[PDB]
Motif scaffolding. Sequence first.
Motif, PDB file in Angstrom:
ATOM      1  N   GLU A   1       0.818  -1.209   0.000  1.00  0.00           N
ATOM      2  CA  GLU A   1       0.000   0.000   0.000  1.00  0.00           C
ATOM      3  C   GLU A   1       0.855   1.264   0.000  1.00  0.00           C
TER       4      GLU A   1
ATOM      5  N   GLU B   1       2.187   1.109  -4.309  1.00  0.00           N
ATOM      6  CA  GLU B   1       1.168   1.946  -4.929  1.00  0.00           C
ATOM      7  C   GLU B   1       1.653   3.363  -5.208  1.00  0.00           C
ATOM      8  N   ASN B   2       2.869   3.714  -4.791  1.00  0.00           N
ATOM      9  CA  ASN B   2       3.412   5.052  -4.982  1.00  0.00           C
ATOM     10  C   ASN B   2       4.734   5.035  -5.747  1.00  0.00           C
TER      11      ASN B   2
ATOM     12  N   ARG C   1       3.705   2.154 -13.585  1.00  0.00           N
ATOM     13  CA  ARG C   1       2.532   1.734 -12.831  1.00  0.00           C
ATOM     14  C   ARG C   1       2.273   0.254 -13.087  1.00  0.00           C
TER      15      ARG C   1
ATOM     16  N   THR D   1      -7.460   0.186 -10.943  1.00  0.00           N
ATOM     17  CA  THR D   1      -7.248  -0.103  -9.531  1.00  0.00           C
ATOM     18  C   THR D   1      -8.496  -0.617  -8.827  1.00  0.00           C
TER      19      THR D   1
ATOM     20  N   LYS E   1      -7.043  -4.895  -8.804  1.00  0.00           N
ATOM     21  CA  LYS E   1      -6.265  -4.699  -7.585  1.00  0.00           C
ATOM     22  C   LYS E   1      -5.914  -6.029  -6.928  1.00  0.00           C
TER      23      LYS E   1
END
Lengths: 144, 162, 95, 80, 383, 82, 123
Positions: free
Chosen positions: E218, E222-223, E235, E265, E269
Amino acid sequence: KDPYFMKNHLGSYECKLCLTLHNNEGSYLAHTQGKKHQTNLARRVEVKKFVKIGRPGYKVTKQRDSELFQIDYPEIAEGIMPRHRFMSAYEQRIEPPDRRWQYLLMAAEPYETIAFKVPSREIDKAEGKFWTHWNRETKQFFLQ
Amino acid sequence: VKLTAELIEQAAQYTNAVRDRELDLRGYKIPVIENLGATLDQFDAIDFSDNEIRKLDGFPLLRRLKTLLVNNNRICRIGEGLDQALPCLTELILTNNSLVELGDLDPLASLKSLTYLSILRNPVTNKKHYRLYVIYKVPQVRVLDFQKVKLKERQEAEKMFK
Amino acid sequence: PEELQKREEEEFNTGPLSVLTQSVKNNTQVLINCRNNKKLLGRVKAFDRHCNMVLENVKEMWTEVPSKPVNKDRYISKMFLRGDSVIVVLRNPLI
Amino acid sequence: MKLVRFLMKLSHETVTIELKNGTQVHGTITGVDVSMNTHLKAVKMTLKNREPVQLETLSIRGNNIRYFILPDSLPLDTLL
Amino acid sequence: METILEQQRRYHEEKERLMDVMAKEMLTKKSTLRDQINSDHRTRAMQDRYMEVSGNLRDLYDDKDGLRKEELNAISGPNEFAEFYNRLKQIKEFHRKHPNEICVPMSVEFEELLKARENPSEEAQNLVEFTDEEGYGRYLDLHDCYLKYINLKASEKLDYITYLSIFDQLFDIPKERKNAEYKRYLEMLLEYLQDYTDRVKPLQDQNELFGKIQAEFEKKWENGTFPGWEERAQRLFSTKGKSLESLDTSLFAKNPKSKGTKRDTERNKDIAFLEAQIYEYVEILGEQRHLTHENVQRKQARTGEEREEEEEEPYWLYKLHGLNINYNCEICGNYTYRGPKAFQRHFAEWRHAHGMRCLGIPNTAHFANVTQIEDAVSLWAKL
Amino acid sequence: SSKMLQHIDYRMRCILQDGRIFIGTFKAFDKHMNLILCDCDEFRKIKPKNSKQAEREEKRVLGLVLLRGENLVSMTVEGPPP
Amino acid sequence: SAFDLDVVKLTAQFVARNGRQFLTQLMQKEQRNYQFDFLRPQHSLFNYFTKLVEQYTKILIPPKGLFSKLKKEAENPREVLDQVCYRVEWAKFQERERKKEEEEKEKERVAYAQIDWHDFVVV
RNA sequence: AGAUUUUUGGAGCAUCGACCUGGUAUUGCAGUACCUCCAGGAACGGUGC
């Protein structure tokens, strides 16, 4: 090599495994093959010599207690504690007459044994692990 | 003496007179019925004659069972979760029991596949309109106390307790 | 004995199962038809006189109707197929 | 050489025998004879469009079995 | 009931016994991998039982804060104690000693010589959680995954070595498309790898490791977990590049990136989480995968015999001598004898002499054949 | 071997070729896969042929049954000898 | 032996809530015509009663579960594994100390059986 | 151990069992398929095509 066939005192053969007798030599070799024979086979000094002895002068101080002697010994630089033991006066180097008492002697490795005679029969206990102590920090031995 | 798996494994399981697999358990005096799942659904009738069972409950899930014999006992109360354990039950022998109130047969209508019923030699049958209440409770039962249902009895059961 | 084994080897090399002998010579895949309409594509490791085959890395495909039927297939590492269910055995498949 | 001798020398192997009438029994095969009789213990059998049941012991015949499935950790050169 | 006094002390004694059993299991040496895995599973079960006992003991503190005002009071005391002693003054006719107050948890947390398993863990078996090809955590079974990959790819040009080489990649280019049907097989391969990692180390905290993996997925994955020097930011869901961090932050909340695509997403996911879990299981258990690849290469390079060796790892004597005949001896407490000669030999023995010494008759030769006591007393009085 | 004689005289259930299951005490067997089931009961599943109808199994007891090997598919143990 | 164990547990529960050494709930019960032979230290049950009283005193600790909740022993298996490893290391150190004491006792017995007991000197 | 009887593969209709109502004669000792007949309703189930 049969460990059961033996020769008797009459010139015969004896099988001790089945306890059988045979007259001639041809009957002993034929008795190993059978039912009964198969059934019987299936059913059946250094530390004492290296101890230095210079014999120094010991310093024992006795005291009559009521409810104990203190032996001042030098530094031995070893982990072996001095042992105390009570013996009789019958064994000696020259064996004097009228020796009928007991003596408690404490012995160490670099020092000589110090013995004290006890005229009484039983007034204390000469056990090592029961009522004895040896402080190695001050090198003080006590036994009560 | 309580009922366990050793009493069911040592019992005599054979073929009955109705060409079904039945295990005899007469002369046991078991106060409670439990641990009956050791049969592995290989029986169609279970006899419980001469028992001291106060309540008929604690039955495991058995789909091969089609007949229940609880005659000669002291069953005063009846269990409610009997339809979920025996979905293929057709015969029920509850003779010589201690049923006094008419509300004890209200879980007995939970069995939809039930066709045979036996409530003889009971104090619940001595009261008035007992057979009419039994017909109005469970309409799927065709034989009640060794007697077939009647159309006039069904009309009297549908007319009463409106 | 030895003569019966030589006769069996001659019947396997020059008989109807000689294409099956092509399965153990160059290790080529063969197409076997089953009784349940399941085609098995794969080479044969061992065979016998009763058409019992041992296949390695075989692919079994069939048609299952859920409309239009889909060609649901599976892949087995090692398998054994009896000769009673064998219908047609093709030596050289198309694809 | 017959293929029954290769199947008879199999013990404590988790195989899957697919029968003729849409049945498939996956389990540890414990016994095999010359008539292809497969006796297995603690197997799971699934019929045609049915729920897979579990059996403590099973004995499938030779003529009723259609195919077999062996694990990948089984050499075929030493069994033939 | 003494929930704060007796139950808390019982829970503390159970926790101390579980800790002593864990220390005795960890102090003993191991010789096999399966026995070590069974001991680790028993230790994990004992740790779970101790954690459950500690959680049940920590909840018994609501009424303790109200009862501590009455328990610590010095004005009260022996009145309620005398009432409880009068309540404990019932019938003591149950003459039965019960030493299993503390010895029964000590024996339940121990094993036997025939089977090294605890009493709660007596029904545990290593064959119900691991296969024979895995070797209780020694290797990993990849034949079914290779068969599923060959069925999904619809081509026979991929062997086990090619599947092991394709599965060894962690952040390289995939062999198939990310939006294809290979993700359904990758999720199953990740769910199998998670169970294989949880079975290889039962003593490790699986919940804390799962929480750490979720936090790493997370807060980091995700960053932009893979920075570059389109190549600057990548990504995992959208599978597209980014110019800078501000453009990626603006496109992270975009309408095609939220739910306006087939790999956004919202729907993809779970596939990205399964891919991250598979990457974490490959990075954590890479040595086991290398050992499984080495075992597969050793099985492929061996012959048939080597692979088969690796995959396998008297009434006549009793009737002539008079035996089996019941005889009663009333002198030595009506004992039984299976022979006349045996009874004659036991008559002049120590047992018959000790039996005759209680009546006062001396051991002589006149009472050799004497059996009844009334005849032996008359024979002793007549002499 | 003698694997077929180990489960003799026990409550075994043999699956037929038509889909029925015969449960009984298989006392005698032969090399042609024959079975002599004492107090046997055959159960055959019936098709629902509807959308809300359930699947039932009609069971009938026959007694001593001599089942040939041409119809027997697989036999499984169900119960111990009483 | 269940009634005597229950009486010993009740005495350990009543004696642990005292505010002094002699001012307890069991010293006044001895003068109240109640026979309690487990209070004297000459009995063999007194060694178990003292351990029960020590366990009852340890059950009233602030980390025992009265005013706080343990988190390392209840929500950390790694801390329990480290405590078990430390207990195993302490048991191994105790076994090594016992082996060293046995070796020292054997050396003292070898030195006592080899000394000369005939050199007597009385001072 | 591969050639027809066992193991190396043929892969809406007709019938039967029931369910519910009335009249009718047999009151009888046996290891059994079945078990008196007529009339009315059915919105019950199995088998083969």
